[PDB]
Paper text:
Here, we study fold transition between distinct β-barrels by protein engineering and structural biology technique. Here, we discover that the previously reconstructed ancient DPBB sequence could also adopt a β-barrel fold named Double-Zeta β-barrel (DZBB), as a metamorphic protein. The DZBB fold is not found in any modern protein, although its structure shares similarities with RIFT and OB. Furthermore, the reconstructed OB fold could also be converted to the four-stranded SH3 fold by a simple circular permutation. Thus, these ancient β-barrel folds (DPBB, RIFT, OB, and SH3) could be readily interconverted by a few feasible mutations through the missing-link fold, DZBB, indicating their significantly close evolutionary relationships.
Furthermore, we verified that the 13 a.a. sequence forming the flexible β-turn in segment 1 in the OB-fold designs could be shortened to 7 a.a. Taken together, very short In/Del and a few point mutations are the determinants in the transition between the DZBB and OB folds.
Residue numbers in the entry:
A (entry chain A), B (entry chain A): 1 to 49
């Protein structure tokens, strides 16, 4: 079961026009939309609104 | 170019064991890791750490 209070983060491997290819904790790489100011090598979080 | 100060959010369509299928603003649906407490119908954000 997902751990309560655990933040979810991914590493930015490639980015173009606000769309980042990120590596998740399990090592899987996927495209996501990322905010402006995010560069390759930066870390992003997935958080509940 | 990505708009500066614009938050990135996605809608949670399906979730299981901390892995959500979310719909991005463009309508594309993808699996992501999501924090504990995220249920179907919730909204998540992608934010720089």
């Amino acid at each position: 079961g997902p751990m309560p209070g655990k933040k979810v983060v991914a590493r930015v491997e490639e980015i173009l026009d606000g769309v980042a290819r990120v590596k998740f904790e399990d090592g899987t790489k996927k495209l996501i939309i990322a905010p402006e100011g995010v560069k390759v090598g930066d870390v992003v979080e997935v958080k509940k609104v």
